[PDB]
Amino acid sequence: DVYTSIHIEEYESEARDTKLGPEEITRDIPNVGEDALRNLDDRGVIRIGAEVKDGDLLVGKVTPKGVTELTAEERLLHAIFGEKAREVRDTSLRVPHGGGGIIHDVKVFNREDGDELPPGVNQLVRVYIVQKRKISEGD
Secondary structure (H helix, E strand, C coil), X not given: CCCCCCCEEEECCXXXXXXXXXXXXXXXXXXXCCCCCCCCCCCCECCCCCCCCCCCCCECCEEECCCCCCCHHHHHHHHHHCCCCCCEEECCCCXXXXXXXXXXXXXXXXXXXXXXXXXXECCEEEEEEEECCCCCCCC
């Protein structure tokens, strides 16, 4: 007996071409939790019906970096790890703590399907989160 509906969130995420000469979209989220990738598939995207939490981008977007861009720490790290490691930038989407809702729907467009895209973009994917709210019980 209340006048209120459910809200609908809309997130954006497109693979922007880097100035270092990109080739394809990849997923590289270092220092990430296992829970954030507990639903993520081999494609690098979270499946539908999965909740949302802080630090969970729910999307794998990272472009290649340059050579000089590296830091002195990476130079010495060579002897630490024994072998150089590819370095990229985190261009994925940022997700707030809690999220408010849950991943119930997700739209993803691919050029291979025949969908035209703007200049500088390689892919397009949006997330849909439904806000859930319930009255207060106990008082």
